[PDB]
Structures are given as C-alpha cells and as structure tokens.
Design an enzyme around this catalytic site. Structure first.
Site, PDB file in Angstrom:
ATOM      1  N   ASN A 138     -58.328 -79.442   0.223  1.00 49.90           N
ATOM      2  CA  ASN A 138     -58.350 -80.300   1.399  1.00 49.90           C
ATOM      3  C   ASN A 138     -58.619 -81.755   1.015  1.00 49.90           C
ATOM      4  O   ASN A 138     -59.118 -82.045  -0.080  1.00 49.90           O
ATOM      5  CB  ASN A 138     -59.444 -79.828   2.360  1.00 49.90           C
ATOM      6  CG  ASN A 138     -58.950 -78.774   3.331  1.00 49.90           C
ATOM      7  OD1 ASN A 138     -57.785 -78.360   3.281  1.00 49.90           O
ATOM      8  ND2 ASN A 138     -59.832 -78.333   4.224  1.00 49.90           N
ATOM      9  N   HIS A 179     -53.848 -74.593  10.219  1.00 54.61           N
ATOM     10  CA  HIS A 179     -52.924 -75.402   9.411  1.00 54.61           C
ATOM     11  C   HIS A 179     -51.467 -75.061   9.678  1.00 54.61           C
ATOM     12  O   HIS A 179     -50.649 -75.078   8.755  1.00 54.61           O
ATOM     13  CB  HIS A 179     -53.171 -75.200   7.922  1.00 54.61           C
ATOM     14  CG  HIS A 179     -54.511 -75.661   7.461  1.00 54.61           C
ATOM     15  ND1 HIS A 179     -54.673 -76.749   6.629  1.00 54.61           N
ATOM     16  CD2 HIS A 179     -55.748 -75.150   7.661  1.00 54.61           C
ATOM     17  CE1 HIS A 179     -55.954 -76.885   6.334  1.00 54.61           C
ATOM     18  NE2 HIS A 179     -56.628 -75.926   6.946  1.00 54.61           N
TER      19      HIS A 179
END
Ligand code: HEM
Lengths: 499, 499, 499, 499
Positions: free
Chosen positions: A145, A72
């Site tokens: 998420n 990420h």
C-alpha cells in the site's frame, strides 16, 4: 489527432493491415451466416430455439460478470520488471535477489479501497500498490500500500472496519456515523487517519505515490540467519497530490483519471519507476524496540533504521485486455519464496489466509491456472489434482500420492522455514492499548509543517461534521490526546460548521 | 506381469528413466521443504495458520469435485480419427466429408445412463456413444446412443422419465413402481423397452455394440439441396452381448469392466472401430412415410431405406488424464457445422438447448476453453467476452461490438441455415397416440425368435414383478396390445412370481 | 404389502386421503396448461423459445446435481435425539450435558469412505458416523467413524492417502499398487489396516457398529478445569458383521442394503440407539503417557482409562427428502460449543479447517443457512453479511461493524477458550517413527483368536496379492515388524496366490 | 437533526432499546468470547488454526460479493402495492385485474444502465423501472424502462450494443468511438438517441419519470379473446428533469441521489405513485397498422390508440436490508400469468430466455427461492427438485415424475396459452429497414418545442464531439436523413468544438 488511450481501436484497425477480417464463429467455432438477425418463422413470427447462434452468444453475454474484489475493486495495472542494483544477498537468499543486474518480470495493480467497480479514482482513500514477482522459486507477491501503516493492528477487526468504510446495510449510502463511530472507538487508527487526511490522502495519478510492504517481514540468508525488515519503493516521478477542489472536479470529469494517466504514460514511452529499499532489524534489536516491531500501526524511524537500496521497478507494457490481465489478477501475500518469511504480525498472519481464500471464490479453485496468475517462471509440480475448469494436463498420468516409489515430485529440504522459539499461553491477547498516540504526535508537530498541519485539521472537520454529536466529542477527545492543539483546532472548525 | 491398465504406474516411471524427481512446489511454484509434517509450535503443539503449504494443498483437495453429469454419469473415453471412405458430398457439404481419405480427429465417450459415479458398468441400461469431430468449420458433436430409438417423443417428459428411472426422492432407493408406473402410463415407450430387456440390453463391453444418431437429421449439399438422414456407426468388432448371470458377477467382480476392457483393447494396439453408415430420405417420401419421420420411437425400414457407407471410426488413443480428458468432455448436439442441420424432431429440438445449458453449470461458463473442448482445428473469433475463468487472450484488444468499422470478424452468407417453410397453428399438439405398437409387434415377432422372446419376457417379468398389482395389470395390457401372447407370457411368469 | 421403503409412494398417497391434487406450476408459481406437450408451430413444426414452461423445467433439471462429498460420498441419514443419563458435569460445562434427563435434537449420517455415489454399501472400508447436536450454544458436530484410530497422524498425508485410495488418474480404476505402495511406505497405518482387514471391516449395516470420536478432545468445566477425553458410542443393537461372501453377493443384489436396512428399521418403530461413554485422562497422566496422547494411530487402554456413561443417542425419524436433509447435511468439527474443545492432535487440527472450507464449495458460502445445517436451537447474531443465496433477512438493518455504540450483539467473556501454555521452536516435527507396532502387536495377539488371525491374513493376502512383487515384499516386512508370525502367514498365502 | 437516511442507525438503536444486546456468535451459533483479539501463542506469537472464530468470520467476509447485474447494476428499490381502479376485465382474465380495489403486493427496482456498481445516479442514460406483482397465479414481472422505445429491434444486436455503451476491452475507459461507431452504422437507434439526449435524458430522481412496458403485449379474456396492448404508467409526482450542470455536480456531490431521494420520500410518509394505462390494438387493427406493430423503435400514438386506465402503483415500504431485498431481486419477463402473453417482438422473445438464464448465473440455480423472489402469494407445486442451496423441503416426499398414479400435481387445461396460427418461411429476416426516420421526425418538430431542439442538438454535439471525424460524418447523415436542419444544427455545433 487524438491520444493513445482514445486511439485504441484506431491503432488496432491499422495494425490489422489490409488482411481480410476473420470469420465470426459461434462458441464452438462454427461459421455464422447472419448474427444481426434472429431466426424466426416468417417476417413477424416467433423466435425458434433452433437459433443456437442467438443462444450461444446471448448465453455467454449473460455471464461476463464475476464478483468484484471485496476491497480494492477499482483500479488498474501494468507490467514491467524489477532489476537488482544492490547486493543484499547477505540478508536474504531469495533467488529474486540473485546478483546485480538480475531481472524478474512483474505485474502491478494500483487501486483504491472502499469504492466499487463504478467508483472514481480521484478521491480521498488509501491506495493499493501490489507487485507480483514471477521468480524462479515460484511467485512472490508484495501486496503493498501507499502507506507504511494501517488503521488497525488485529485482523479480527478488518472486516468490521471495511464494513464501516462502506455502505449502510439498510440505506446503501456511505455513512459518517459508521465511519467515525468506529475510528472514534479505536484510536489505534489515529496514526493512519492522520495520513489519509493529510495532503497524501489524494495523490495525483498512480505514478506519483510511494509503496510500502507495510508489515514487518523476515529475511533469511543462505546461511540460516534471519532478520526482520520493511519494504519501501519510493516513486522516481516524485510525489504529487491533488487539490481537494480539483479532486471532486476530476472526479465527475474523468472518474478514471488514474487509469488513462498511468496508461498514456506507458503508451507515450514515459514509463514510471520506483526504488526498492528495506529497513533491517536484527532479532536482538526487535527485543529492544520501545514498541511492538510487529504493530502495523507503527513505523521504523528512518534515522534509527535507515533504508538500503536493492533495485529498480519499471512498468512498460500496458495490458492488452483489461479483464483477462488485470481484473483476473490474484495477489497472494502467502506467496513468499525461499528467503522471505512472515513475522508474527497479527494482521499479516490473517492475510496469509484470506487472500487465497477469496480468490477461490472470486475467480475459482484453479485461479492459479489463469495466465496472469500462473507462475510461468517456475515449474509447478505436486500432488494436487482436478477441480472445476481444470485446464493444463492436470499433470497427466503422474503418480498422485506422496510418498510414492514411482519418482514423482520430491521436496527440497533446503527450502524449509526458519526455526524460531516461542513460549506462552494460547490466548486472545489485547493489542487495543498498545500506544496509539506517541508516534502520531511526532507526526503532527514534526513531519507536518504548520502550513499543512492546519490543512489536515480542515479535511477532518469537513467530514467529521457529518457525524452525530456524541460521536464528534470522542473523536476530538482522541485528537486531543495526540495534542491539545490538535483537537482544539478541529473542534474549532466543527463548532463553526455547527452554527 | 499383468494387463497394461494395471501396469500404468510401472510404465510411467520407466518413461521417467534418467530424469530425476521434480521439485515439490505449492500451487504458486514455491518449493516445499517437507510436505509430510506440519508446522507447529513444539512437537505436540498447535498447528499454525502460517503453514501455507498445508492450506495450499488442503484447500485444493477440498475442491477436487465437480457435479457429475445428470445422466450418463458413468463412462469411459478415447481419442482416434474419422476416415472418409465414400463420397457422399452429393448429399451434404460438411467439410468433414470434403474428400475420401480425409481424416478428422475425433473424441468419444461411452457410458451408461441412470447410475451415478460409482455404479457398475455391466447393468441393463441404454448406452451412450458420444462422438466429437474437430473440424475446420468448428466441432461437430454426434451425441448418439446404442439404440436407434428412445422411450419417448416429447422432450417435455425427459426430466420425468429420468426421475422415474433414478432414485426415490425420500428413500434414495431404486423404485420399480416409479419405473413401471411411468412406463405403463406411456406405451410409446414399449418399442425401446422391448429392445432394452432384449439380449442387447447389456452388451459385452463398449466395443461390442453399434452407435446410432436416433434423430432424423438434415444435410444440405454445396447446392443447398436439403435431405433428411439417420446416422449409424455399426461395430466392426461384432455385436456381442453379455448374459444376465455374468453381468451380475461383473457387477461386483468388476464394476468398471467397460473402462478396463477399452483401455486395454487400445493399450495393446487392438483399436476397435465402427463403420459409419447413414440412410437418406426426401421431404417428398417424408410427407409420404406412414409415420412421423421425426418421431424418436420409430425406425426407417432397411428395405425402403438402405444404409449408405460413409467412412470409418478408429479409436487408437487412450486418455493420459481421465479428469481433464473424459470427465470434462462435453458434447452439445447444437455443434453442427454447415452441412448438417437439425430436424423438427421434438426431442432433438430440446437437446439443442439442454446440453450447453448444463455444461455452463457442470463445468462452467467458459467450458469451451477447456483444452479437450476447444475447437482447435478451427479458430474462434467473435464478440463474446469475459466470463469466469477466462483463459487465452480473451481476444486481446479487438472490437467487442458488431457491426463496427475497424476490421474485426464477419458473417458468412455461405453458412446460413437452409430455409424451410412451415405453417400451422401454434399450440401444444398431443403426440401421445402416434402408434406405439406397430413397429414393436414386427420387432417381437419377426426380429426375435422363440428363445429370445422367451428371455425377453422373463427379463421384463423379473423386474416388473416387484411393482404393485395395479401397475402390473396396467403394464400387461400395453404388451398384449403389441400382441396377445406377448402379454400372456409375461403374465404367466407374473402369477408364478406372485405365487 | 412390501417393506415400508417399497411402499413409500403408496403411503404418500394414503397420507393425503381426500385432499385434491395441487395445480402444476412453473418455478414462478405460474400455473401450467399442459406439461406433456411442447409448444410448436404445426404438429411437426419447430420448438418455440416462447415455450417458457419447457425451458423453465429443463433449466432446472440441468442443474439438479451438486458436487458429491470429496470422501464419504455414499451414505444414509436419520434424525433422533440425545438424552443425558449420567452426570458428567464435573468434567464439562457443555449445556448439552447440562442435566440428567435432558434431550437434544440430533442428526446423523452413516457412510463408506472411498466409494463414489453409485457405489455399494457392503464393501470393506471404514464407516463414517457423524452426529450433529442442535444445542443452545450452537451446533456440536461429533464427526466420528466406526474405528477409534486411523491410518495416518498428520493432515498433510490425508490428501495423499485418499488419492491412493481412489482411482488411477489415467485409468480411473482401483490400483492395488497405489494402495499398498502408500501403506507399505507409511507403517503408521498397520494398526488401522489391521482393524480394517479384520472382521469389522464390513458391518451388517449401520445399526450394528460402534461410533468413536477417534481424536482426543479437551473438556472444560465451570471453574475452567480441563481434562482430555475420548468419545465412544456403542451400538445397543450389538456388534454384527458380514462374511466376505455375503457382502460380495449383496454388493450386486442390493448396493443400497445399508440405506434400506436403516430406513425400514425406523419406519417400523425399531429405533436403533447407541450408548455414549467418554474416556478421561487428566493433564498430569498425559505428560506421562507411554505414547503421544494426540496420536490418532493409538488407543487408550480400557484397563487404565475406563468408559463413563454419558447418555443415549436414539434415531426414531427418517428423512422426508433425502437430498434436502441428508445430501446437503454438513458437519464441522469446528462446531464445538462452550465446554468442549480440541487437542493439539495434528490430524484433528487440520480438520478444523478443511470441513467448513470444503462445505463452502460443495454447498456454498451460506450453507449454514440450509435448514438441516442451521443452528435453529440457538440465535445467530453477528457482524457477518451477504454472500450468494442469502436467506432470512441478513440480520436486517442491524449495525454491521464491531465495536459500535448502537446496541448490536456483543461477545460473551464466559465463552473464552481454556488457556494452555506451549513453548518450542516453530517447525515441522517428524512423527513417523512414533511406535507403529506396539499396539498393533497387542491387537494381533490378544484381541484376536486363531480363527480371526486366519481370516485377517486371508483378507490381506487376498488384496495384497495384486500389488507388484517388490511392494508385497515391503509390506510383508512391515507385518513382521509387528510379529514374525504375522508376516509368514500373509507371505504363505502370497506364495500360494503366486501359483 | 438530519434526514431519515442519515438517522438509520439512530432509529435502529432507538426501537431496539429497552432490551439487552444479543450475544455475538459464530455462523454455527456458538457464542464468541472475544471477537476483537485473535488466538495466538504468547503476546507476540503466531496465529493458530485453532482460531475458528477468526476463520469463520473472515471466510464469510471473503465471500460477501456476487456478480453485479450485467446491465443496470446501479439502482434503488422499494415495495408497495397495485390498486385496481378500473375494470379492463374484458381483456385479461388475469387475477391481478380481477376486481376494482383489488390490492396486489409489488416490488420495484429503479436503475441506470451502462454504469457499474460504483457509478453515480444522476447521469444521462436510460432508466430501468421494473415492477414485480406477487399474484395468486404466480408472479408477474413487468420489466419496464423510463421510455416506450429502444435503440435496437433484434435481440442479436443487444449484447453488441451494450458492449459499445461500456468500457474499451483494453483501455477500460468509456469510449465514444464505439458508442458512436455503433449508433452511426445502426440508424434505427435515431428515435431513442433523440429521446436519450432530450430534456428527459436525466430525470430528477426515480420519482419524476414514467415507466413503460415498451414491447407490445397480448391480453386474453375469459373467452379466449386476445388483443395487443402496451403498458404505460405515469408518475403522479410529475415529470421533473435535471439540468446538465445540476446532475454533473450532483455526480460527485452525491452520486447516490436516487437512493437518498427515494429512501427519504418513503420515509417521511411521502409515498410516490404512478397510474397504469394500457394502449390496445385488435388483431385486425394490428394488420392494417402501418409499420411493424412489434417494432420496439416505433410507438403507438394516443391519437388512434388511446390510453385506457387500469390502476394505481403506490410505494410505501423501504427495504430493511438492501442486499437481501434489492441486490438479490430478480425480475423475469418470462414470468407472465394467464391473461398476459408475449408478442412476436424479437427483442421481447429474446428477453424470454436471457433473463432467467443470467439469474441462474448471477444468483444461482435456486434463485426463485430467495425470499423476495419467491412467488409467495401463490403455491409452487411441480416436479422440479434438488439443485444447489435448496431451501424449503424440496417438495418433500411427493412423486417426482409426471404423469403418475399417486395423486401428485396436475396441470390446468384452463391455463393453456392462446393459439395464434402462424405461417411463413423460416430464416433470419432483415430488420434494418423499418423507417428509422418517420416517428423520429414527428418528435423533432411535433412533440418537441423549439427550445428543447436547441439544447438537444447541443447535447449530441457535446458528446459526439469526441468521436472520429469520419464517424461524425455518418452520424449527421442519419440526423439529416431525419430532417436537414437537424443534422445541420449539429454539423454546425461540431466544427466549432473542434477549436
Ligand atoms: C433483447 C434485448 C434485451 C436483453 C437481451 C436484455 C438483457 C438484460 C439482462 C441480462 C439484464 C440483467 C438481469 C439481472 O442481472 O438481473 C437486464 C436487466 C434489465 N433490463 Fe434488459 N434486456 C433487453 C432489453 C430491455 C428492454 C426492452 C427493457 C425495457 C422494457 C429492459 C429493461 C431492463 C431493466 C429495467 C433491467 C433491470 C432489472 C433489475 O432491476 O433487476 N431491457 N436486461
């Protein structure tokens, strides 16, 4: 006239009025006479160590970079707040859910996964929607998420997985053989590969996607009763993906599409919002679920376990300095205040460790001392001291051992973890064969319309085609197991691409 | 009861008074219910990852230490102020001297040199007298020692010197051969060696000694008139030295003696102080001086260079937290505000580089952001950005490039290096034989009297005696060159010792 | 000719007789012209940044130091071997005990506990005795101490304990209040404190002391038959301690007496050695043991659980470079190869985490690749990659994900943990009231004689006298709980000390 | 089948076959029993700290990253050798040039500039071409670019320049406001900018571009005679560029074009190669020379100063592990063996410290010890010790101070640098005046055909078109300052883009 984004220095210049400019000082705050010309002996003489102005600034320049996130690495964040609109205090005594109207400030960060700092937003990858709640009981990090499930259900394979999702050790290039050899060897990923390669695989901006705590958590009421739950924060701006065709386009046009969009949204008074829901599962129920209520690769049917609204999520203050406020951001899943607890989810458990771990290495030991990460809506008081780059007052001359007879910080028993029983041998129990299709099947023929049911089958073959042959078979053999027509449509496309 | 130092905890609690204990939180502000027992399955069962209270605490404790200073590791600090008693403005423009009666907040750190973290205070060794002034032109660091000279004049040997003075690379023990071989191979050390084994080799506490700047410096008045100088902060508590027998006692009776003496001196309003004087010199009389005026192994005769009083140095505040205030204190000779500039002092020139360089490693790239280090009496503004552990606003959203056209920090023609002309070949000029006896001889015969000379010789002999014969004869020679008798005396005790 | 340690540099010379000096180079291998003079413009001109040689060295000198160990900072090390002399294979399948007459390389580090790096060796303090075995199945670190028990029995108190054992946060001095306030409040420490203040509190160097595993571990054989055990390695040099009087002398005379003693002993072929025994207790007996068998503050009576000869440890080789092979040395209780496992010992449990964790900080992410720490006797093949200061080939271009169909390393099923059943509520069980006087009472009455009891109370009273009155009361009361006489004795002395 | 890069794992498993896979172990070398299932209590139980298999792996994964190069993060690398073809003996004593046919191992990293780790290969931006020669006199690092000039001429302007070429401090997007504001205000860039947007601004791989030493250097022969040279190495595979639309799609098509391209070339036996040339200029000639011969924005014409050939640079080896060999690769300009010395080039001199400095940060204090950086074709011998992550033996037991009487490394008087007499004042001399238009003109008309000029102007406009009007104004001013029609052509293209 330009856009807010590109008009950054613009607005800053004005907002600086006609007030003279500050003075260019060295790091030590010493006045700088001339920083545009080195200190030399003669007009064509050598560089003197004596030019400490040079060293001071150059030296700093050489160390502006810190390690990027392991995963990420590419993304953006903004601030805003959460406000209760429901009373679920009958479910969890979490001060963050005090009463209705209760507002807690927050910080959010969106991001992809596999891509690096230089990568582009506009690509097929899952997305990160992390929320930091600066509550009165410390900080609560909902590191979620844009999906309720994940590819694997045991942490021990996460590194391996991410490895397969990145560059080749020798070539340093993405590699299908790696990607698909893994996925193919682990069908539990089916359910998720199905979402990634579905129309959802590539949203449009961060504002048009949903959030998911993913894992099964724990709620404990102000009475000790506990229950399992799931967090959901659906977008109010409504969903919205991007045509494969447009994706790769925007990709090279503005690799930072997500950033500016999300940025200009807030600058142009158009603040994004999401609605927080939760599913509830009693302990009794969990004992009943046909599946593992803790399996990360599984969802909770909306009909069987309906959502309950709890609050609003609003972003309305873009960062003032990206590095300081977003890059340095640290979200620790373990950061759960009284009222919320983890479940025996073999993936959530591991995350309890790894996050604060890497943060120590990516940012530094005292990373919770960085503004953005500091729990300022609480009062940090304990028996920890020192460490590199220790700001604050290091808690002054306060007694540093517990217990002590000098009135140093005492522990509040009321914040004790929730008691549960467990019986069984200590072993490495196999979760590989815990059904990796059923839930997927009801997705193919049910959630997906024949229209997009086929689209997905295309997205896959177009990427699966790049893998070796033996690989492609296993993959199909897997899709087949979800539904014969699944691995049949796919095998079709592949065979053609195959000439 | 007992000294204030030993009553620290007692006092801290009495300050608590009515206030009640704070809640015990994690680094994340989450309250803990019981920080005395671990979370386990069963009273005699395994520990669980789930105990993030443990891992939070444990993980920090594991990261409490930072590298100790490579030299002068042992020490103590205090805060106080500087006071301008005399107008010296006709020599320098430093705003710290702006006007008589002006007080500038100062920080100070005393220390030994060779010993590591746990070494004794009362041992023969030079003494560190670092002073920090938080001015409006940034911070001024006057990193002085308790000697006006040093063992060498070329920074290139410093590493080697310190190596010879520290532990043997393989046995880890103190080595007389290393100590004496180096010394015997570099007579330019004699001056500072003599001073070292003299009654001043071990002062009684930190308050009973003077502070010197050693290096020749540079001052330029409001008219840009350049002058050389020396700094001297003579003790107002009188020069008191400690005997060899008692130093040995305290060595084990109380290795932190200096730390205790100091804390208590201030804790009882017995603020020690030093009058800060300085001597001046012209580039004319400089080119005239019989020695290299920038040679670290020499002194500017009092007769020719009378001391000029400047102001006072009062220490009236003890640290509240030693790590954050003393351990993390950092002094860089390069931090000189306009009005004070370096000099061609070979040694000095070296320190201009080494201090911030080592700070960037011992503390971190952003060490200046450490509260105790931040130049608060001044406001920092420039184009340096990011770097690990970046606190404050990282200059928010101001232009990071210079020049620019958006109104950000600017130059300061007012504060430009005083220009001096230089000429000559560019090489590594040998300074090995720039008189290493003259000033020592005058010391040994006129500065000392027979009893001191007597002691000085046994002191040297008692240590040298453990070095190898060849190093001994080697060392003797150097002494005789300062004086036949000087050598013969030490020689005497040597044969006796060798018995 | 002096002792070997003194003649180190002398022998190094001799060592390479005719051999000629190597060319002096920079870190980059570039040969140096003159390392004693700095390159400046003119004999009295400024320093040039162009003098990379200087800059090359200074930059390194500036970063020579790494964080000292958080505890056990002051120590000495050596290398030798472990030879099997008795068959105990029916208890463990560990390849290290594999067969009679089998030798395995080992590394060892001795140490104090609370003192920093400068500290003296001869001080009352437990003594670390860590052994690293370079076995076929990886390294086995038996990180023992010179005592079979400890002050606490739950890892959560450790940071607290150590803190109280170090220096006052504000004064940076040793605080008896801190020490006794803690001990007084945690009576589980009586046993250790009783051993600590006895005669053994200050051995005559490292050679004259026993080593112990302290904790209980689980031994597993070929059929998967487990048993709990304890490790004891008794000095073959015989027990021998130092009088409080000597130690104090040695303290200032030779702060490195242990270092020097061990080195010289080996250097002169007088290799020390210990005999390793083990205590065994079946899973049945544990269930009916009069105390908690994993309680670090308790011992296993020699009477019911006899010692069993295993093999011998022999140190015959000194380190070549202390920093390289000792200071960098790292032991992890987690390094247990097939046949050796842990117990639920709360203290041992927290240790599985903290050592590697702290090693990643003190040394670095790849500290396992440092020569002295590498399992050079085994072949490391896994899916781990990268990290800073990565050496070797990083496992080349091997597949970096598991599972994979490309022949990369695979797990061995025969190296699976011995499964055990556990069942209970998950929570923080209190281990305070777990008998803190029975065993102590025996030590005071049977293990000691009148002579010894007299010294012990003298030693205690000598230290405790400094704690605040209310604190002395508390502690004395604790000793009484052990034995009425125990309290009176100390109290008597106290009364005295209080004039 | 497919390209070599794609069949990476395929071949690995190929040559590995005929063998049994290795046993998976922990960092400590202990074989793991099952690395796919975590250790828990019961099938649905929590994760135990007991699982050191888990913590070992995860902890490491949490540390795989290190900071990326502050600039040139995106790059590819390979290894080969340098073959001497001609004798420039009468110029440099440098062993690398000793004889004809002399082979010297090398390493090379090609890279873009402002792009981060995730950036794409085929973008308009200068290209980094660095080569490291492992010579017996240490390593020689020739840090070149794919052009002989550079935007700025004073190191001080560099960090600032770089900031403008990167992201906005607050929005984080590539910003032409800073890009152009900088360039406009700073007209010396004119030369490079022209080249930047030239047809070369985007090469077709690293194989079709030339390398340039850029700065003027100094060579020294066996007879203390030195001259000022330049380094030019031209591709043998010819200069082939990419169209703006080609590279634009390649951007998302395959952002790892360079990587793949170079990997496969070498993989198929098609090793690329370059020819090294040196321009020369005597100290006298340097004098008579027009402008500053050390101006990085100026160039030497083959006309008056011809290109002398020296040898061949051939690349025939790919990395085995990209992280260990390319990512960790560090080139230090300051690494220059005897026969090669810096030149008064400010910019250059500035790079003398900036490079090793940042390496100690991004890589660590002991970076010259990482295999690929080590000066292995030489022999390091010095008085530097310790520092974190120290491999080797830390130079063993050798004496650590210089000078010494125990036959340790001695310097080489033969290696003394070249003495160039220098005279002149001392101060920050201006440089913004060195004709930022002459050479520039002889490009827009001489070295550039009409056609190129067309699209060139088009390029600057295509980019600049997004900059503040007032910016453009100044922008053109400089261009027209070069030559009317230049700024004119642009100025026209402008207003059009403004719809
Ligand atoms: C005074 C101005 C300059 C400064 C301060 C500077 C600074 C830097 C820095 C800090 C790096 C990162 C090093 C690393 O992380 O490994 C770098 C890399 C690089 N620079 Fe510069 N640079 C300057 C001028 C130039 C010039 C003139 C050239 C060409 C002759 C150049 C070519 C390169 C190359 C090719 C790299 C990449 C090396 C690699 O692959 O590791 N730089 N520079």
């Amino acid at each position: 006239n330009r856009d807010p984004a590109s008009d950054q220095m613009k607005h800053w210049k004005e907002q600086r009025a006609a007030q003279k400019p500050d003075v260019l000082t060295t790091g030590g705050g010493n006045p700088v006479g001339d920083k545009l010309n080195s200190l030399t002996v003669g007009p064509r003489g050598p560089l003197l160590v004596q030019d400490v102005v040079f060293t001071d600034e150059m030296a700093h320049f050489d160390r502006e970079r810190i390690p990027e996130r392991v995963v990420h690495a590419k993304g953006a964040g903004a601030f805003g707040y959460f406000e209760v609109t429901h009373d679920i205090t009958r479910y969890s005594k979490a001060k963050v859910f005090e009463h209705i109207g209760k507002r807690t400030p927050i910080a959010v960060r969106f991001s992809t996964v596999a891509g690096e700092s230089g990568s582009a937003d506009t690509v097929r990858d899952p997305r990160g929607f992390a929320v930091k709640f600066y509550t009165e009981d410390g900080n609560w990090d909902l590191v979620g998420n844009n999906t309720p499930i994940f590819f694997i259900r045991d942490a021990l394979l996460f590194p391996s997985f991410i490895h397969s999702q990145k560059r080749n050790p020798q070539t340093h290039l993405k590699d299908p053989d790696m990607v698909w050899d893994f996925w193919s060897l682990r069908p539990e990923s089916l359910h998720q590969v199905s979402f990634l390669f579905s129309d959802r695989g590539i949203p449009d901006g961060h504002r048009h996607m949903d959030g998911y705590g993913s894992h099964t958590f724990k709620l404990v009421n102000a009475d000790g009763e506990a229950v399992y739950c799931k967090f959901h924060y659906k977008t109010d701006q409504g969903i919205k993906n991007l045509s494969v065709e447009d994706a790769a386009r925007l990709a090279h046009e503005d690799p930072d599409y997500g950033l500016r969009d999300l940025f200009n949204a807030i600058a142009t008074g158009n603040y994004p919002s999401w609605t927080l829901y939760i599913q509830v599962m009693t302990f009794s129920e969990a004992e009943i679920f046909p599946f593992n209520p803790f399996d990360l690769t599984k969802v909770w049917p909306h009909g069987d376990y309906p959502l309950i609204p709890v609050g609003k999520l609003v972003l309305n203050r873009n960062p003032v300095n990206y590095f300081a406020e977003v890059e340095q951001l640290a979200f620790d899943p373990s950061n759960m205040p009284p009222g919320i607890e983890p479940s025996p989810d073999k993936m959530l458990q591991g995350r309890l460790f790894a996050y604060p771990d890497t943060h120590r290495h990516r940012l530094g030991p005292n990373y919770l001392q960085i503004p953005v990460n500091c729990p300022y809506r609480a009062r940090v008081a304990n028996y920890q001291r020192d460490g590199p780059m220790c700001m604050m007052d290091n808690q002054g001359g306060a007694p540093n051992y517990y217990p002590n007879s000098f009135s140093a910080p005492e522990h509040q028993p009321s914040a004790l973890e929730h008691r549960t029983h467990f019986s069984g041998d200590v072993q490495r129990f196999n979760s590989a064969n815990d059904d990796n299709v059923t839930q997927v099947r009801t997705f193919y023929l049910k959630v997906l319309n024949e229209e997009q049911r086929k689209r997905l089958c295309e997205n896959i073959a177009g990427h699966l085609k790049d893998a070796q042959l033996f690989i492609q078979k296993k993959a199909v053999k897997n899709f087949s197991d979800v539904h014969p027509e699944y691995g049949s449509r796919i095998q079709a496309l592949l065979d053609k691409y195959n000439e």
